[PDB]
Amino acid sequence: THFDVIVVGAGSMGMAAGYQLAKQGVKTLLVDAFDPPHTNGSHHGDTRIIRHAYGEGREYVPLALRSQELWYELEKETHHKIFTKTGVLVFGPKGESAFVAETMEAAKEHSLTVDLLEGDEINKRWPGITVPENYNAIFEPNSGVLFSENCIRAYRELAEARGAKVLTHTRVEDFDISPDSVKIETANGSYTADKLIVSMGAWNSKLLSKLNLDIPLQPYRQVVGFFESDESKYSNDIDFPGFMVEVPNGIYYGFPSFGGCGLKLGYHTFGQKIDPDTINREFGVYPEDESNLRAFLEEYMPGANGELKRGAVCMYTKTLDEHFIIDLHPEHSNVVIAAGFSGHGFKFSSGVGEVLSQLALTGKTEHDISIFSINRPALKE
Numbered sequence: 001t002h003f004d005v006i007v008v009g010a011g012s013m014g015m016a017a018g019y020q021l022a023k024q025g026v027k028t029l030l031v032d033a034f035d036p037p038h039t040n041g042s043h044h045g046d047t048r049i050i051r052h053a054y055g056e057g058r059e060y061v062p063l064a065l066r067s068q069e070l071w072y073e074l075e076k077e078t079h080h081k082i083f084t085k086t087g088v089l090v091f092g093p094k095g096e097s098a099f100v101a102e103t104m105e106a107a108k109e110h111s112l113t114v115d116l117l118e119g120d121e122i123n124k125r126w127p128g129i130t131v132p133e134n135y136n137a138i139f140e141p142n143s144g145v146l147f148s149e150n151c152i153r154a155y156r157e158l159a160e161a162r163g164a165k166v167l168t169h170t171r172v173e174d175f176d177i178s179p180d181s182v183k184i185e186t187a188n189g190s191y192t193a194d195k196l197i198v199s200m201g202a203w204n205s206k207l208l209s210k211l212n213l214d215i216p217l218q219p220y221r222q223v224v225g226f227f228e229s230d231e232s233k234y235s236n237d238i239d240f241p242g243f244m245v246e247v248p249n250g251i252y253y254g255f256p257s258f259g260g261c262g263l264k265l266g267y268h269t270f271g272q273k274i275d276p277d278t279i280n281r282e283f284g285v286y287p288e289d290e291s292n293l294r295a296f297l298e299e300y301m302p303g304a305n306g307e308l309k310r311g312a313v314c315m316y317t318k319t320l321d322e323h324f325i326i327d328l329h330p331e332h333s334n335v336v337i338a339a340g341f342s343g344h345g346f347k348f349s350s351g352v353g354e355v356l357s358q359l360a361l362t363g364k365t366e367h368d369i370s371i372f373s374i375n376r377p378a379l380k381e
């Protein structure tokens with residue numbers, strides 16, 4: 001019940017941190033409210049996009065590239081499938097998309113490998129896409145799709161084999177922080193360590209107040225749907241890409257069909273404000289769930305608009321500036337916080353696990369994480 005490090009929340013970020021700590025022989029306890037991977041947090045629905053040319057900001061590119069190399073390393077270490085190089089297509093109306101423009105600027109700044117296309121060039125290259133002639137695109141061939149549940153399961157199995165312990169179905173209810181130690185309280189007992197990593201996903205919005213932190217964090221209910229599609233156009237086997245696109249009523253993202261699962265789509269810039277303990281996790285309970293998806297499909301990917309095969313309900317946790325929080329607690333250098341991933345953190349989770357392990361062990365990281373500071377002005381109302 002004493003450890004070197006305790007990770008609270010063994011999800012996307014926490015489980016990666018656990019792997020990085022265990023690989024260094026650091027005796028780690030991970031505590032999760034469920035049994036990860038699971039369907040109650042932010043990491044299910046099978047698949048996640050990884051992009052390198054980064055439309056949310058060119059400053060994420062180093063972490064994206066480091067994370068990509070870590071995912072290739074993970075592929076080699078496990079029998080679970082980690083990554084498929086689908087490429088990622090980004091498109092939008094010419095001159096009317098900040099996301100597209102920043103994606104292009106990031107690629108230029110970092111000498112990333114991309115193709116530039118416009119109008120009917122897009123429809124011709126990828127049968128099944130129907131964009132207007134005034135749309136332009138940037139395609140990144142060497143990014144792709146992560147199997148997110150498999151990533152967390154592989155990190156867990158590898159960490160446990162090296163002696164990490166995973167206490168499941170155990171909610172942390174409170175914390176007690178001292179100068180020279182950390183303590184968590186649960187119904188199944190209290191545990192102590194030298195250092196704490198706090199990575200509770202959407203529950204960071206509810207429980208960071210138990211560490212005397214007051215940070216705006218808003219959970220959002222974000223659905224995805226898998227649709228019966230024309231496999232001769234939308235299969236990964238015919239090189240249909242992953243995508244993240246801007247259109248006049250917002251940003252949508254999606255995935256090619258893998259083994260006939262259907263094209264998967266989500267709507268990024270809308271979701272319901274929720275609390276993670278009362279969210280309705282059934283797909284289709286609000287009319288928007290299915291209708292906002294088919295509105296996009298009928299316009300832009302009309303042969304991927306068949307029967308709904310599967311739906312899922314997941315959560316984002318947004319900061320006011322939609323940048324992450326990765327830092328030491330301002331009052332407690334033995335406490336590390338990972339929060340506020342704002343709907344775009346999974347791809348970085350391998351690199352973030354490395355950052356969190358460095359912060360926990362040394363109070364520093366070799367990564368540049370200034371944009372993720374817990375003290376920055378734009379976090380606050």
Ligand SMILES: *Cc1cc2c(cc1C)nc1c(=O)[nH]c(=O)nc-1n2C[C@H](O)[C@H](O)[C@H](O)COP(=O)(O)OP(=O)(O)OC[C@H]1O[C@@H](n2cnc3c(N)ncnc32)[C@H](O)[C@@H]1O
Nearest residue numbers: 009011012013033041042049172201203314341345346347
């Ligand atoms: C929901 C979603 C997210 C998403 C996305 C599509 C959807 C529908 N598409 C993405 C994409 O294509 N590419 C990408 O890079 N990101 C994408 N995202 C976002 C991403 O999935 C999230 O940013 C990321 O998963 C956040 O990870 P985090 O580690 O913060 O969250 P988590 O995996 O849910 O893990 C939190 C864990 O904490 C446990 N927990 C909660 N409360 C407690 C307490 N009290 N005690 C102990 N454990 C606790 C949870 O159970 C969970 O396992």
Ligand SMILES: O=C(O)[C@H]1CCCN1
Nearest residue numbers: 049253268343344345
């Ligand atoms: O993180 C990404 O790549 C996009 C996909 C959906 C949400 N954010």
Ligand SMILES: [Cl-]
Nearest residue numbers: 316317342343
């Ligand atoms: Cl998130």
